[model samples]
Target: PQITLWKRPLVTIKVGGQLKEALLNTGADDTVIEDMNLPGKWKPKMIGGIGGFIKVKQYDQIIIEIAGHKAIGTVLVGPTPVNIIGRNLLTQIGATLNF
Candidate 1:
């Protein structure tokens, strides 16, 4: 069965060994996930995105699992309203939008 894109491709992924829902926006150049528990080598940082700028704890080389696929990418963490997967990771996975 072919999955439809009518609904935003909001899917689940294993991040830091926790199954969490993340947005496959594919629009943003970077990725951000809302989590204050997970730990890694993170430094103080902020980013100016397509819209406003936000304070986020940027992290790199973190474990990212997308549909059983093992991938690690630069994921920003902080008080993000939504969890988003970077376009780079999505491109590697080849997730597409078909209308």
Candidate 2:
């Protein structure tokens, strides 16, 4: 299915066996999520955004489902205003922006 671009392209996704709403952000290179209890050891890293940089825990091999399409990849957990599904996962699900 084709995904239409919007001011805020919000979609429901399943992560770590839980449902959460996330924004489809083409501008983002990687998927980032709010703080959650995930089982795994993560490498500490910093990510820069529009405002500044924030420390994030980079976890690999995370499985997330968007619109019933599943994609396994790395997920960054940090303090973000909103959860974002970036190009990494979007590409895996064959999600394309339709203007």
Index of the highest-TM-score prediction: 2
Q: For each candidate in the order shown, give its overall lDDT on alpha carbons.
A: 0.78, 0.89
Tens-digit lDDT string for candidate 2 (9-51): 8889998899999998889999999999878879999988788
Error of 1 at 59 (Å): 0.9
- Candidate 2 has its poorest 10 consecutive residues by lDDT at 1-10
Leading candidate by lDDT: 2
Runs with alpha carbons beyond 4 Å of true place in candidate 1: 1-3, 97-99
What does candidate 2 score on TM?
A: 0.91
Model 2 gets an lDDT of 0.89
Error of 1 at 23 (Å): 1.0
TM-score of each: 0.84, 0.91
User: In model 2, what are the clashing residue pairs, if there are any?
Assistant: none
- Candidate 1 lDDT over 1-99, as tens digits, reads 245667866778888889988878767778788856877888878876767888888788888887677777788888787888878677777777666
Candidate 2 shows a clash count of: 0
